[PDB]
Design an enzyme around this catalytic site. Structure first.
Site, PDB file in Angstrom:
ATOM      1  N   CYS A 112      -2.937   0.897   7.224  1.00  0.00           N
ATOM      2  CA  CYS A 112      -2.997   0.409   8.428  1.00  0.00           C
ATOM      3  C   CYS A 112      -3.313   1.246   9.594  1.00  0.00           C
ATOM      4  O   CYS A 112      -3.877   1.028  10.636  1.00  0.00           O
ATOM      5  CB  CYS A 112      -1.182   0.250   8.857  1.00  0.00           C
ATOM      6  SG  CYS A 112      -0.548   1.729   8.858  1.00  0.00           S
TER       7      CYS A 112
ATOM      8  N   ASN B  23       0.693  -1.125  -0.057  1.00  0.00           N
ATOM      9  CA  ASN B  23      -0.058   0.081   0.013  1.00  0.00           C
ATOM     10  C   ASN B  23       0.640   1.186   0.169  1.00  0.00           C
ATOM     11  O   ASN B  23       0.307   2.450  -0.435  1.00  0.00           O
ATOM     12  CB  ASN B  23      -1.210   0.076   1.113  1.00  0.00           C
ATOM     13  CG  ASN B  23      -0.480  -0.317   2.579  1.00  0.00           C
ATOM     14  OD1 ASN B  23       0.715  -0.861   2.506  1.00  0.00           O
ATOM     15  ND2 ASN B  23      -1.168  -0.163   3.611  1.00  0.00           N
TER      16      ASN B  23
ATOM     17  N   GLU C 147       6.594  -2.648  11.889  1.00  0.00           N
ATOM     18  CA  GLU C 147       5.451  -1.882  11.621  1.00  0.00           C
ATOM     19  C   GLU C 147       4.535  -2.843  11.019  1.00  0.00           C
ATOM     20  O   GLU C 147       4.685  -3.337   9.902  1.00  0.00           O
ATOM     21  CB  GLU C 147       5.682  -0.709  10.671  1.00  0.00           C
ATOM     22  CG  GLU C 147       6.751   0.266  11.029  1.00  0.00           C
ATOM     23  CD  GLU C 147       6.638   1.480  10.318  1.00  0.00           C
ATOM     24  OE1 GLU C 147       6.547   1.417   9.132  1.00  0.00           O
ATOM     25  OE2 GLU C 147       7.423   2.355  10.988  1.00  0.00           O
TER      26      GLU C 147
HETATM   27  N1  LIG Z   1       2.257  -0.246  11.185  1.00  0.00           N
HETATM   28  C1  LIG Z   1       2.525   0.316   9.776  1.00  0.00           C
HETATM   29  O1  LIG Z   1       3.020   1.492   9.826  1.00  0.00           O
HETATM   30  C2  LIG Z   1       2.011  -0.195   8.486  1.00  0.00           C
HETATM   31  C3  LIG Z   1       1.841   0.443   7.299  1.00  0.00           C
HETATM   32  C4  LIG Z   1       0.984  -0.136   6.180  1.00  0.00           C
HETATM   33  C5  LIG Z   1       0.571  -1.431   6.401  1.00  0.00           C
HETATM   34  N2  LIG Z   1       0.788  -2.206   7.253  1.00  0.00           N
HETATM   35  C6  LIG Z   1       0.330  -3.752   7.509  1.00  0.00           C
HETATM   36  O2  LIG Z   1       0.753  -4.534   6.374  1.00  0.00           O
HETATM   37  C7  LIG Z   1      -0.105  -5.416   5.802  1.00  0.00           C
HETATM   38  C8  LIG Z   1      -0.329  -5.223   4.445  1.00  0.00           C
HETATM   39  O3  LIG Z   1       0.700  -4.988   3.912  1.00  0.00           O
HETATM   40  P1  LIG Z   1       1.491  -6.235   3.050  1.00  0.00           P
HETATM   41  O4  LIG Z   1       0.499  -7.286   2.332  1.00  0.00           O
HETATM   42  O5  LIG Z   1       2.524  -5.549   2.227  1.00  0.00           O
HETATM   43  O6  LIG Z   1       2.311  -7.427   4.240  1.00  0.00           O
HETATM   44  P2  LIG Z   1       2.991  -8.538   4.015  1.00  0.00           P
HETATM   45  O7  LIG Z   1       2.159  -9.589   3.095  1.00  0.00           O
HETATM   46  O8  LIG Z   1       3.344  -9.020   5.468  1.00  0.00           O
HETATM   47  O9  LIG Z   1       4.384  -8.411   3.236  1.00  0.00           O
HETATM   48  C9  LIG Z   1       5.138  -7.000   3.809  1.00  0.00           C
HETATM   49  C10 LIG Z   1       6.488  -7.269   2.653  1.00  0.00           C
HETATM   50  O10 LIG Z   1       7.096  -8.424   3.268  1.00  0.00           O
HETATM   51  C11 LIG Z   1       7.711  -9.257   2.242  1.00  0.00           C
HETATM   52  N3  LIG Z   1       7.677 -10.690   2.547  1.00  0.00           N
HETATM   53  C12 LIG Z   1       6.777 -11.604   2.459  1.00  0.00           C
HETATM   54  N4  LIG Z   1       7.252 -12.921   3.302  1.00  0.00           N
HETATM   55  C13 LIG Z   1       8.551 -12.279   3.558  1.00  0.00           C
HETATM   56  C14 LIG Z   1       9.279 -13.017   4.429  1.00  0.00           C
HETATM   57  N5  LIG Z   1       9.195 -14.249   4.734  1.00  0.00           N
HETATM   58  N6  LIG Z   1      10.541 -12.722   4.480  1.00  0.00           N
HETATM   59  C15 LIG Z   1      10.913 -11.251   4.425  1.00  0.00           C
HETATM   60  N7  LIG Z   1       9.963 -10.520   3.781  1.00  0.00           N
HETATM   61  C16 LIG Z   1       8.804 -11.059   3.464  1.00  0.00           C
HETATM   62  C17 LIG Z   1       6.848  -8.749   0.810  1.00  0.00           C
HETATM   63  O11 LIG Z   1       7.092  -8.951  -0.546  1.00  0.00           O
HETATM   64  P3  LIG Z   1       6.153  -9.996  -1.407  1.00  0.00           P
HETATM   65  O12 LIG Z   1       5.361  -8.795  -2.179  1.00  0.00           O
HETATM   66  O13 LIG Z   1       6.946 -10.698  -2.209  1.00  0.00           O
HETATM   67  O14 LIG Z   1       5.253 -10.809  -0.588  1.00  0.00           O
HETATM   68  C18 LIG Z   1       6.411  -7.338   1.319  1.00  0.00           C
HETATM   69  O15 LIG Z   1       7.415  -6.475   0.875  1.00  0.00           O
HETATM   70  C19 LIG Z   1      -1.344  -5.257   6.767  1.00  0.00           C
HETATM   71  O16 LIG Z   1      -1.626  -6.117   7.918  1.00  0.00           O
HETATM   72  C20 LIG Z   1      -1.252  -3.961   7.431  1.00  0.00           C
HETATM   73  O17 LIG Z   1      -1.997  -3.268   8.488  1.00  0.00           O
HETATM   74  C21 LIG Z   1       1.449  -1.831   8.612  1.00  0.00           C
END
Ligand SMILES: NC(=O)c1ccc[n+]([C@@H]2O[C@H](COP(=O)([O-])OP(=O)(O)OC[C@H]3O[C@@H](n4cnc5c(N)ncnc54)[C@H](OP(=O)(O)O)[C@@H]3O)[C@@H](O)[C@H]2O)c1
Ligand SMILES: NC(=O)c1ccc[n+]([C@@H]2O[C@H](COP(=O)([O-])OP(=O)(O)OC[C@H]3O[C@@H](n4cnc5c(N)ncnc54)[C@H](OP(=O)(O)O)[C@@H]3O)[C@@H](O)[C@H]2O)c1
Ligand SMILES: NC(=O)c1ccc[n+]([C@@H]2O[C@H](COP(=O)([O-])OP(=O)(O)OC[C@H]3O[C@@H](n4cnc5c(N)ncnc54)[C@H](OP(=O)(O)O)[C@@H]3O)[C@@H](O)[C@H]2O)c1
Lengths: 474, 474, 474, 474
Positions: free
Chosen positions: C283, C153, C249
């Protein structure tokens, strides 16, 4: 007569002349204090400059241990010191004992704050690549000899608020209490003597400020002047200081802005507390109420009733309203009361004076045309000024040359914060009366209410300097 | 004549009278600057107080953006401004362009430093349990209208060093350059005009300080005085300031203490660099060498050879030694040279003066009996004073009423740090000549060398105040 | 196919395999990104560790200048980068351009914040007199090689929020964007390439995290892991990090507590703004409303009307509600919608889905028994949970394992501050929707919402270490 | 048997099982400590989480007063506690009493440091004009329940170094001493019991870490883990911590780099002091000398003579070298001694072992091929490794996976500072042996020597979080 002595270079000294002190409430002689000669002032200063290097050479913790001893001694003898202080400045006995207690507290706080002032290491690379190997090791240092001067309403407290922060940092002290309150100032001196600080590190000066005051301030041996008292004298010192550093805590005419959504009962109690404390002989005290007309009648009647509940009498009886510090003060207040009355203000309380004891008086319908609206009385007289808008309240407030503190009574915080930004003061209390309250908090005034920022940590920072050592890393 | 104008409330204004400026090296007329009337000074100040609230109302970032614009403009026109500056104060051309560049740098640094000043939240529970629900939200605020005054040797740089830190914090400015250097000061004013800051936020004043100076400083509309110049005038301002805040950067007589384990060649080059820079017309400059007899002959011969390598001539030729700012200055220096000579000092360089250009002269065997040992010359004359112990070096050093900076040339750091602690100065440079160098570093002087601590961050802190808002949490 | 390349050691590199990216709204192929082999990951890391020393050797200002260049380039190409970002993650075009703009802003801010991190000089005399000559010069230092991972996002913004703070301090970077959003991550890489940072200082990694993710994190060459994404993966990384430092995060389920004295219209607009932004794919977003029954009906009707005013459509049309990132996400959200509905919640908006575009839906009467009350949907679905007391609101709030932020809508600040103290979250917004808003502000989450404190200054502090050098002064 | 009890929720409790402790020097039974069941661990944690809110509700000063009481009690009973500590870990008696004294000191310092942690007020206008009315009030908050674990060589000191900083901030504590040293850990518990802290605020856990350790760390009721001990267990905890915060103080192999211009006699004394203290059973201890060949022979002979002057014997006789903590340790050290010897190192001191008492041995000609060059022995064995350049010294130093501290013996400070920058350690001592010395100074390790920065102030900052409350001013 019971002749008190000045503490000079580890010794107690009388002078050829003395000044007799009397109790403002009874006229009874309390004892006498020395009337130092300029030559004696010279010796106090020569003693301190001589002792400074070795004091500065001690470790911070050693200096804090000395100060902790002083505070411990003050707590032990708080009833003793409090009994005389109460008598010397006609302030209630319990509150007098509280001044001593609060002194120990600030001495103990400044002691622990001072051994925790840190330095910095700066990088030349932050400003220019060419100086990336150049670093600056910046450490604090004492200014030298500090001259401390307390006022009659807090001769001990407002002395310790200057002495402790100064000493912990390595500076030496020359303390001059107010003549009316000098006996108590010397009782505090006793604590520093018992604690056993090295000769010359702490000394006292006594004599009428109106006679040797300019001398002690203009003296070139003095490196810093920390003063608490009237604006007129502060102005003086500001000039007599030259380019030398100073810290002035001067007059105040604190206003209590009461908006239409205020809890009037809570507001009435705070105003009463802050306005009539120590017979209005407090710098941080609600000295004028700027209330919205629509809530004014109700607030005034509450305040009216409460004023009538205040006790009036002698310090030993712990009365709310005690006799003013002296005749000239009571006369001055009376003239303010008169100007208001003759001009049309509505006295909601009886105008009565016996000796120098002035009963508390509430004045409604005060206008910006009356002296009582602007001049600091330092007596139990409270003017109520009704406004028709928050903007007018701010206008009338900022119109004063005084800017110590202010109170805003309302339940709209974001608005209260916007107002506070425009108020030309040091501190703004929301739903509370003004106060120096909690000495770890900054304490400063705007306009002619002072110079410098106090509160323990700021006092320390203010009475220290910096020594920057720059070198290059290979 | 080319008549420059003052920037007042968004407009450029001439006055009924003007002052013609000439080039110190050729005598050629450079143009003229207004000789403002007190009434015109009143309008500058009235304009600024009127504009302050709206300037303070802007966001910090908006104010930093304005300042970044000014700096960008200075960089663009650095050759233009530098060509006139070089001519107005007889300073080499390249170094003149460097002053402009350094100004832009400090304006850009102060801009980013200012939007990063944070406030504090204090707890009443740190001091007393009863006030544990009471917290203080402390935030900084501008002092109001700041009067800035730069010296002739750095009319632009040492103006920008005051204007930027002041503006970023919300203060408004009234800038008065030195008469000899006022044309350059108005060229800097052009940059603020082009950057487009709101009318009244930045204004300039011109006229002889010896004639309207007391007026502009004593004016009650002025809330803060930031000054760089002579001790005599600083003393003046210190008094004319009353209880008002000020920052003074005054004279210096920096000493270079050379111990027996110093790298004499590296020491010789630094002393030459700092001593003869801008013909010795620099406040932070080695103005006296206190060297250990055992290494003195060797150090002096090196310094002697190097002095002879310095170039002498016109600013346009980028000569090391150029003509002094004016006749009175050259005459004053000559008297110092004469006192030394007639008293027995050993001139190791020829005494020669043409017009107001004084060739660089090295004096060995200078004693504390000669004027040159104590008085700030502001000319290309360097006295060498041989000592027999580190303790004597410190004694002679601290003996001066000046205390800007000092250099210690040695390879024993722990010892060098011990000495630095005893030197009554602001900064101590180890194995380097003295300098204001790297503006993120604190810059201050002890004794009669000044009041206040500068350096970007400290300047900002010094020209701001605090607003404390206290409330209770339920 | 348009094949993008990874930036590795100053060069752009394709891999034997690629991953084709499609637009979530149309299915159109956008291009492809490399599917790196572990051997290629090893080379990125080897490149960075090799370049670190020389990068760390630069001056702070030199590193800030590089970063200012990158930000300037991003601003120049913001429409270019924004057009592709909009297409890659199905986010409105204008908001996509805003992400790029916000990135430049944080890069520029971290650049100026980083060259201003200062060290400290501590005294042994504060702890023990015997060590009074012992001082500690403490200076910051980079951790080494930092691995940064952004979410889908905010692939650019939440990458730059890690890269800039890391680089300014001397660390080197290994950046891995999300696969869906990797093309945009490489467009940001282009900016670092054009700015001309030394080879190896900044590199990118691409491939499915579900396939090479564990590898890149477990790699011992990595000194710090800064991650933004799901809780599940964060938990993973927390363990794969060992005793290595990390910043996570993770998820959030921000609640909006609405008391009875709230301005319902202002509350309704904020909840709508924060709840439906980017189709709820944020988030920091109001993901559950805990409102007082007595004001619930009124607040809900307002929210109901506003939901109907939201636009629904394609990113290029700047619609409020656009298609979710992928099919699995839309299916997951639908199940939440179903569980709620079948369980009795009151859908006040039509349940409709076309492709992966889910119309916004408001659910009233949600109970702690429904999944929608706890699980983070990441879709345009908002549950309203009515409570009967402030204590219940706090109970239900803290009941979640999530604790990013919270909003409290009320006009009672002291009370609002008391509640904020009990809410297990990072930030509490009073009368505003939640947000990472103003990057100088701390940004952190409690419980399973993360590890570490962000916001520019904190990020920098978190990705640096300290080097203490202690010596004694003679 | 003398059965000690755990302090749990205001009560002392035995368990169904116990563990008998013996004196490492004589084998004599000292008493027994409980072997808690996981159910008992659950009750300690449930007790603490229950008491936390009310503890956090107290004022900072009230919590500092409790801690000052504990320290005062420790000082009173320092001989008592020191007599048993000396016997339990076979450490000299006087040094045992010194541990208790040092504990009181850190408890008193953390108490005064903690009531002085301030918050911040940030401006939105620093980042964006649009948020200029938005301010952030940031205040610290406890993490919750902290699990503290001390090592056998400092069971009391390194427990108090965690307990005080934790408690002052509002956190509650669960303390688990090492089994060998658990009796002393419970003697410290007695002080917290006498000081009278509320039930549940401070509790202890006892049982073999090798049996209940993983349980107490993995327990989800634990919010923070502060551990001091071996790298292997730290690695463990790092993983068992998940995304939970931790502070690890692990192994060290401190090197003493001796350049050619060092004062060899001063260097020899420091190395001896740091290397053989407590039989080498110290984490911060010179564990390897990397000296320049040209000065090696001379330094080694001095060190050789001094080693022979060390006393060897029983703790009660205050011998320099006392018996190692246990048989396994002595055996391990012997193998290191053997590997070195059999590999060609030159033993300049007799290899002798009686029971578990190993006489001090100096090894010259050690190479990077021997185990003794890298492995932390925790015995009185010191390897000397001769190098031919400062660059090799740095190479061999940084080659270790350990990075606690380092000493550089030289008289070239700028060079020493350049070296210090390259040394991958926490602290670099110039011309002094390494040490945690002066607890106000930061204490941290690089690589596998730990996680987190300690020293009083840093400990407190590390075991607290932040609560940001953002609102807009009208
Ligand atoms: N707290 C905050 O500031 C913040 C901000 C924005 C969003 N969020 C949270 O993030 C989530 C949505 O974002 P998302 O789908 O991008 O999350 P996600 O699927 O956990 O992935 C985040 C990142 O991690 C990578 N990844 C996947 N498996 C990993 C592993 N085993 N080792 C290292 N890297 C890995 C992904 O690359 P790939 O594309 O190849 O899988 C991606 O760059 C929601 O739950 C949301 O609330 C938190
Ligand atoms: N803002 C604050 O923090 C603070 C606190 C409490 C009170 N005050 C203010 O103090 C005033 C009441 O106190 P006060 O009547 O005692 O004040 P004051 O008349 O100004 O004198 C106070 C002190 O200054 C001395 N003094 C007089 N002339 C001096 C001279 N030229 N040189 C050096 N010292 C001189 C006095 O010695 P003598 O006694 O011999 O004259 C005394 O120690 C009010 O304006 C009140 O608001 C301010
Ligand atoms: N410590 C430092 O940081 C620093 C830096 C550089 C130089 N300096 C010092 O400055 C001196 C050389 O500069 P300078 O000759 O320009 O100094 P100056 O003669 O003292 O005058 C300095 C500035 O003050 C104005 N001025 C003079 N008298 C005034 C008065 N009555 N009230 C208010 N303003 C008045 C001047 O305008 P007019 O020209 O019209 O008189 C000029 O702008 C040396 O002593 C030197 O070391 C100090």
């Amino acid at each position: 007569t019971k002749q008190y002595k000045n503490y000079v270079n580890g010794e107690w000294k009388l002078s050829e002349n003395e000044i007799k002190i009397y109790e403002p409430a009874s006229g009874a002689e309390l004892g006498s204090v020395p009337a130092m000669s300029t030559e004696e002032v010279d010796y106090v200063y020569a003693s301190a400059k001589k002792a400074q290097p070795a004091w500065r050479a001690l470790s911070y913790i050693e200096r804090a241990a000395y100060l902790h001893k002083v505070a411990d001694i003050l707590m032990r003898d708080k009833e003793k010191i409090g009994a005389i202080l109460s008598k010397e400045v006609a302030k209630g006995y319990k509150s007098a004992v509280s001044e001593v207690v609060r002194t120990a507290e600030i001495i103990n706080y400044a002691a622990e704050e001072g051994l925790r002032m840190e330095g910095e290491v700066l990088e030349g690379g932050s400003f220019e690549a060419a100086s990336k190997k150049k670093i600056a090791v910046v450490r604090r240092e004492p200014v030298g000899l500090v001259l401390a001067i307390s006022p009659f309403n807090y001769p001990v407290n407002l002395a310790g608020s200057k002495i402790a922060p100064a000493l912990i940092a390595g500076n030496v002290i020359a303390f001059k209490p107010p003549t009316q309150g000098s006996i108590s100032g010397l009782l505090l001196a006793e604590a520093f003597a018992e604690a056993g600080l090295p000769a010359g590190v702490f000394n006292t000066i006594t004599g009428r400020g109106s006679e040797i005051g300019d001398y002690i301030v203009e003296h070139q041996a003095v490196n810093f002047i920390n003063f608490t008292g009237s604006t007129g004298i502060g102005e003086r010192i500001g000039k007599m200081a030259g380019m030398r550093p100073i810290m002035l805590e001067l007059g105040g005419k604190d206003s209590a802005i009461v908006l239409e959504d205020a809890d009037l009962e809570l507001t009435a109690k705070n105003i009463i507390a802050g306005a009539f404390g120590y017979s209005g002989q407090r710098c941080t005290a609600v000295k004028r109420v700027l209330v919205m007309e629509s809530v004014a009648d109700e607030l005034v009647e509450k305040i009216r009733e409460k004023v009538l509940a205040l006790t009036i009498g002698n310090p030993e009886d712990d009365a709310d309203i005690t006799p003013l510090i002296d005749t000239k003060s009571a006369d001055y207040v009376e003239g303010l009361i008169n100007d208001a009355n003759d001009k049309g203000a509505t006295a909601l309380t009886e105008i009565k004076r016996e000796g120098n004891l002035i009963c508390p008086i509430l004045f409604d319908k005060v206008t910006t045309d009356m002296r009582l609206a602007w001049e600091e009385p330092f007596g139990p007289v409270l003017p109520i000024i009704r406004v028709t808008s928050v903007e007018e309240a701010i206008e009338i407030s900022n119109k004063s040359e005084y800017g110590l503190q202010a109170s805003i009574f309302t339940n709209d915080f974001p608005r209260a914060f916007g107002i506070a930004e425009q108020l030309e003061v040091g501190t703004v209390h929301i739903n509370n009366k003004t106060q120096r309250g909690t000495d770890n908090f900054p304490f400063l005034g705007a306009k002619k209410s002072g110079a410098g920022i106090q509160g323990v940590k700021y006092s320390i920072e203010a009475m220290t300097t910096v020594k920057s050592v720059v070198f290059d890393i290979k």
